[PDB]
Nucleic acid binder design. Structure first.
Length: 64
DNA sequence: GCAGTCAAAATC
DNA sequence: GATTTTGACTGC
């Protein structure tokens, strides 16, 4: 794709990126657009991580 | 200089 | 069309 991995995304969860103004944002998988989360790193990241838990509700596939 | 959203490019 | 992460843009 255009951007696979970045330095800021190294500390961010999936569906969450940081802008140039130090503001984080959550991208929706329905359209790819997003909204401002928070200017804190552990805050915006923690928020996107929770949503990822629900988004990951489906994963168990007969693991061993 | 913050606050909040959509486009850019490249892939499958 | 989907995705994935960064860039640009507007308003005060």
């Amino acid at each position: 794709m255009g951007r696979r991995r970045s330095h800021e995304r190294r500390d961010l969860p999936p569906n969450l990126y940081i802008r140039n103004n130090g503001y984080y944002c959550y991208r929706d998988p329905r359209t790819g657009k997003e909204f401002g989360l928070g200017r804190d790193r552990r805050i915006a990241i923690t928020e996107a991580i929770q949503a990822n838990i629900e988004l990951f509700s489906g994963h168990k596939h007969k693991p061993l």
